[PDB]
Structure formats: structure tokens, C-alpha cells
Ligand binder design. Sequence first.
Ligand code: GDP
Ligand code: BEF
Ligand code: MG
Lengths: 172, 280
Amino acid sequence: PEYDYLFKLLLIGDSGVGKSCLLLRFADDTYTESYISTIGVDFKIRTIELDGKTIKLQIWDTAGQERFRTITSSYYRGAHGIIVVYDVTDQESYANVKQWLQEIDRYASENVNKLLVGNKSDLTTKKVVDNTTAKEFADSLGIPFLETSAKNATNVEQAFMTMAAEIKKRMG
Amino acid sequence: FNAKRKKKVAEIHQALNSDPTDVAALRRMAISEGGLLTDEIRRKVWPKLLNVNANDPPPISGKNLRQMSKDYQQVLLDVRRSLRRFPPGMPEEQREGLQEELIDIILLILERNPQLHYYQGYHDIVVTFLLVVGERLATSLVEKLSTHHLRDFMDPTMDNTKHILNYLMPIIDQVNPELHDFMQSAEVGTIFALSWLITWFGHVLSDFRHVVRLYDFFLACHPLMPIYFAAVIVLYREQEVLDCDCDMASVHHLLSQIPQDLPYETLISRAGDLFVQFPP
Ligand SMILES: Nc1nc2c(ncn2[C@@H]2O[C@H](COP(=O)(O)OP(=O)(O)O)[C@@H](O)[C@H]2O)c(=O)[nH]1
Ligand code: BEF
Ligand SMILES: [Mg+2]
């Protein structure tokens, strides 16, 4: 055997918030200034270490634009954990989180693990969504919240680890 | 190749000069090995191929194009991340100018045609035209395209596009029934060709010279051609799709990770013959 558990992750979220960039930070440990508009769907692979046991995480990337929802909707059921990403510098992205959870309620598993990420925490001059205001929303819902920068190494690593633990504990 | 190419330029020029433009022979030249060769030939030919008049005056771009357009933010977003489609050589100042141009073409077409809906990926098409035809020509040609070949990709919903994508499988079944049965076992679906179909393989193929030569081929043929081209690729990749785990993740990622060295000219000829053999 190679891995002890395989968990299926899905990066849901608005468009241009940082999903693609995040996945590249965690799975490849790079960051590229433009990268590429994510069209359709695909995944990157990364196996980690947690509480003795070894975990193969396969993490799926999505297209943000609304029209693309009915295409990626199919890829929710098979997900152990779904990560809702918004950009802290963009007010609509945070305002849309509410709609994204509505998608998770609609398409994802009955008991799926959730996590809410505010990305681009490195842009302090342009920060719009409030640190304590996002935390409070998450807390009311019973979801882990983290603020992450994919540009700086910052906090990208811990986000996925926090998600992997939550799935594991639930899984048995 | 040289003398054979020299002939083609003379053939293509003879067809443009013909008493009425020999569009038939231009399509035929576009499908044949090498496409339309220089982008300069294309500036002449492509307009003939789309029936847009090359010598028309430019469309009027009104005062506050970006300001009032509902699609400014999204388009801007995609154009920013279009960087890799530009030649490595061209300097930032020039590239940014073209990018600023690219945003304006898209937003205008979207304005001139209210029924058309922007989608992520449209920008890969427009930028291809922008770098061949040029801003003035690209804007008129893509409009024609947007209302015919890409007409379904710009419907409010993804419905017609999904339907087009579904073709891929009945086509594979006609040529390699066993492969079709393997892929269905895996439940790969057809969303691996989304990028391919919607951007005319422009989002996915790295080498620009190969992208325009594909555009040559797509302009001359039927609107649904790109999917028959997708089918031909999967079929060409038979022994890797089968020699591979029969679960979605494995097959989806494999097809998704498209080879950079396809036998374009061989695949095109297969696409053609497959289109005529199993027509839509
Ligand atoms: N400063 C900063 N910019 C980011 C960060 N993540 C993404 N970006 C920007 O957003 C663009 C790409 O966003 P992307 O990840 O493709 O968005 P998504 O694919 O819709 O999630 C990049 O060109 C960067 O300019 C980040 O963590 N910090
Ligand atoms: F542009 Be992101 F991938 F929604
Ligand atoms: Mg993305």
C-alpha cells in the first residue's frame, strides 16, 4: 500500500479570488503572476502527513463565472470537503459566499466538511472584507475560517491541513 | 516543402484575384497541409472565408465602452491572465497595449450584439484574431464568428454547449466502440473537451503557429468541427486511455493533460474524413 486515506477536495468560489493560485501554492509550491483563466475542471495531487497516518489529497479546481455552475455541479457529490474561497479585497466575492453555500446544500454530500477562506491577505492597503466580520459568519455556521495569501507563503498550507483533519475525524 | 509551399502562395493569390473570389479553392487551400502559411495571407483570406467585407469602415466605439458594459470586470479579469498567449519576445509596453485593445474588442462585440453572452475562454479566440487580423479586422471577423460558429457558446445557459460536448462519445463509438465502452465504464464524461471546444483549442495549445493553422482549418469547415477534432485526439490517444486506470480521476486528468506534440496535420485529415463519414 502507498496511502492510508484518499480524500477528495473541491475548490469552490467566486471568479478571480485565487482558487487556481492557492492550489498551485499547496500542490506545486509555486506562484505565478498571471497563471491562466481556469476553464472547465481539473485536479492537482498532494499527499500529506497527519496524526501518524498518510493522506492522499486530490484537490479539484473550478471555474468561477456563474454560467459554469451547472457543469461543475456534478463534481460536488464525490467531494469529502469543499472549500469556499473569496477575495478579501473584493466585496462581491464575500457577498457571494452565501450563494456558494447554497450550491453546497444543493449538490454536495449530506454530511460534507466545509471551510471558508479569505484569500489575498497580503494586500493590506486594498483589504475590504473585515477579519472579525468573516470569522463571525463562519462561527455562526460552524465552519473553519482562515485568511490566506497564495502570493506570500502565508497560511495556504494550514488551510488544507485543517480541512484534511476535519474529514479524517469524520471518516473514522 | 519549399517549392510546394511556393506553389501554394501562388495558388492562394490566384484565388483572391479570380473574377469573383474563388472561395472554394481558399477553403481547400486552408484545409490542405500548412494552412494559409503567413498571417499576411490570412489578413486577406480570413475575411473572404467569413463573408465579412475586408474593405468596410470600422465600427464606431462609443464614448464610455468599459464604464457602462456589464462585462467589464470579468473580461478585464480574463485578459490580465491571457499573458501566456503573447509571444515571449514582445515587450511589456507593446503587450499591454494589445491587452487594452483586446478588452475593447470583446466589450464592443458584446455591446453591438446584446443577445450574446460572455464566457471565460472567449478571450482566447479574440486574442488569436487580434494577433493575426489586427484590431480593426479582428473586431469585425469575430463578430461574424460570435453569431454563427460560437453562437451556442454564448447562449445564457450552458445547455447547447453541453449538448455539443455530448457528441464526442457517439463519434468515438463509430470508430472505436471498445474505447467508447472503456470510457463509459470509467465515467469520464466530456468536460475534458470544454476548454478545447469553447476556445478552438486556443486555451490549451501552447504554440501559436499551430493555433492559427487550426483556426484556418476551423473557419473553412462546419461549426461543429472542433468536436470531431476532439474525438480524433482521444482516438489517437487510444493506447494511453486504455493503458490507464478505469476510474474518472485517472482518465479525466490524462485527457485533460493534452500532449503538446500532436500530429496536427494527420489529425486534421482524420477529422475531415470522420466528419464526412459520420455527419452531424
Ligand atoms: N496579491 C495576491 N494576488 C493573488 C493571490 N492569488 C491570486 N492573486 C491574483 O489573482 C490572479 C489569479 O487568480 P486565480 O487564482 O486565477 O482566480 P481563480 O482561478 O478564479 O481562483 C493572479 O493573476 C493574481 O493577480 C494572492 O494570494 N495574493
Ligand atoms: F477564473 Be477562476 F478560475 F474562476
Ligand atoms: Mg481558477
